[PDB]
Each structure stands twice: as C-alpha cells, then as structure tokens.
C-alpha cells in the first residue's frame, strides 16, 4: 500500500503518458448495483445493465474512482457481483472517507488531490456533492429495473475526454438542466 498525504485521499496521478485526461468519481449503491430483500429469495443484489461495459469502456478516458456512499463492509457485501470487472476501477473510497458537516455526509472532491477542473462526479444524492455541484452530473436513483441510462451517459463523457478542454465546470453549467444531459447532448 502506497498512499496519500496531508490528508489528501488519493496518491498523485501517474505522469504522462499514463495519466488520463480526466477523473471520474462515481457512487456504488443505486448506480451500479441494487440490493433488495424478498420472501422468495434472500437478500439478493443486482448489477445494472451495462455496468461491466461502462467501467471497462470509460477506463480508457477516465481515472475511475468508486466513491461509495456506504460504509466499507456493507459496500463490499453488495459490490460482490462487480468482482470480475472491478479491476478497471483505479481507487476505492467509502463513507468513512466522507466529511461530516451540517448533518450530512459529503464526498469532498477537494480532498482528492486532483485538479478540480479535471474531475466529474456522478451521484444519486445531491448532498454527496453539496460542496462541488459544478462538477456533478445528477442521476435519479436506480430502483432495479433494466434500463440503459448508464450507457447513454457515455457519448457525452467520451466527448469530454477527447476534447482538450481546460475546464469541465463551465461545460456542465452550459446545460440548463443536467438531469437531461444525455439527450440535451443531442444538439
Ligand atoms: Mg451486465
């Protein structure tokens, strides 16, 4: 284990040519997986349609940080079905790494030791990015039904990485509602 200082959560990015143009921070529950209890089956957990492709494909443009909103043991339990694909994640973070202020657990992007102009967070609770909403792409919580909402995020995210932009924050502010970002991306 080689890791961060003072008291930044991530070690420094590798130098070019290995550095990715951008850092993508994503949450775990109600985004990649969904867990539920029924009488017929146990506690079962499901992986979203396209999760494997999503992580594998975007890893070529992004340093992918899986920042769970859950404590680590619970996170590990419901993330089990992500095992064969999990190696494409660069770093793992958990609720233990959030900051507590105003009765809210916040993923404070400034503690990531990353240039904030080069960082995107996708999450299902706006409080998780309460300190840096200008970096955020909101998603409504996944309830377990098959969809392709995940994969449809890719063309815009792929666009950002292959377009030399020196800041990602003014571009997200150029949408007048980020909840329809994927299709608003259609001219
Ligand atoms: Mg799948």
Residue numbers in the entry: 171 to 357
Extract from the study:
After passing through the TOM complex, preproteins with N-terminal targeting presequences are received by Tim50, an essential member of the TIM23 complex, in the intermembrane space. The IMS domain of Tim50 interacts with the N-terminal IMS domain of Tim23 to deliver the preproteins to Tim23. Tim50 also functions as a hub protein to interact with other TIM23 complex members such as Tim21 to regulate the opening and closure of the Tim23 transmembrane channel. The crystal structure of Tim50(164–361) contains a large groove as a putative binding site for the presequences and a protruding β-hairpin.
The crystal structure of S. cerevisiae Tim50(164–361) determined in this study is named Tim50_new and the crystal structure of Tim50(164–361) described previously is termed Tim50_old. The structure of Tim50_new was determined to 2.67 Å resolution by the molecular-replacement method using Tim50_old as the search model. Six monomers are present in one asymmetric unit of Tim50_new, while only one monomer is present in the asymmetric unit of Tim50_old. Compared with the previously determined Tim50(164–361) structure, significant conformational changes occur within the protruding β-hairpin of Tim50 and the nearby helix A2. Molecules B, C and E share very similar structures throughout the structure and belong to group I. On the other hand, molecules A, D and F adopt a different conformation within the protruding β-hairpin and helix A2 from those in group I and belong to group II. Surprisingly, for members of both group I and group II the putative presequence-binding grooves are occupied by secondary structures from the neighboring monomers. For group I members helix A1 from the neighboring monomer is docked into the putative presequence-binding groove, and for group II members the N-terminal proline-rich loop from the neighboring monomer is inserted into the putative pre­sequence-binding groove. Tyr223 from helix A1 of the neighbouring molecule makes extensive hydrophobic interactions with Trp207 and Trp213 from the protruding β-hairpin. Moreover, Tyr227 from helix A1 of the neighboring molecule makes a hydrophobic interaction with Tyr244 from helix A2. Therefore, it is likely that Tim50_old represents the presequence-free conformation of the IMS domain of Tim50 and the Tim50_new corresponds to the presequence-binding conformation of the IMS domain of Tim50. The inner side of this β-hairpin is responsible for recognizing the hydrophobic surfaces of the presequence helix, while the outer side of the β-hairpin is involved in recruiting Tim23 for subsequent protein trans­location.
